[PDB]
């Protein structure tokens, strides 16, 4: 380990820059739109089949 390793300081220092993630929400909205597409597709198919 680092000879002067303080877990609280090192982790906190790495975490502050590390904590900048928002990709999940955007991906969720895309998946949500994909799910609406799936349902809409089935409904159109139902009209035709």
């Amino acid at each position: 380990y680092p000879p002067d390793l303080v877990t609280n300081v090192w982790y906190a220092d790495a975490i502050y820059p590390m904590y900048a993630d928002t990709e999940v929400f955007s991906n969720l909205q895309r998946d949500m739109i994909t799910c609406e597409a799936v349902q809409t597709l089935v409904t159109l198919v139902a009209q035709i089949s």
Binding site: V6, N8, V9, A12, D13
Partner: protein, 48 residues
């Protein structure tokens, strides 16, 4: 209409260190000015 406030950065970085003598100096100065702060919740902040 007037509020006295203190930057958290005035407090020791990363909350300070029990082993840090420089942090000890920051703590002493902070303790001295903590009563000075007009902030009502300032006691809570110094305690934290």
């Amino acid at each position: 209409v007037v509020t006295t406030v203190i930057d958290d950065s005035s407090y020791p970085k990363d909350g300070g260190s029990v082993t840090s003598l420089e942090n000890l100096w920051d703590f002493f100065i902070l303790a001295l000015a903590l009563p000075l702060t007009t902030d009502p919740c300032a006691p809570v902040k110094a305690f934290m």
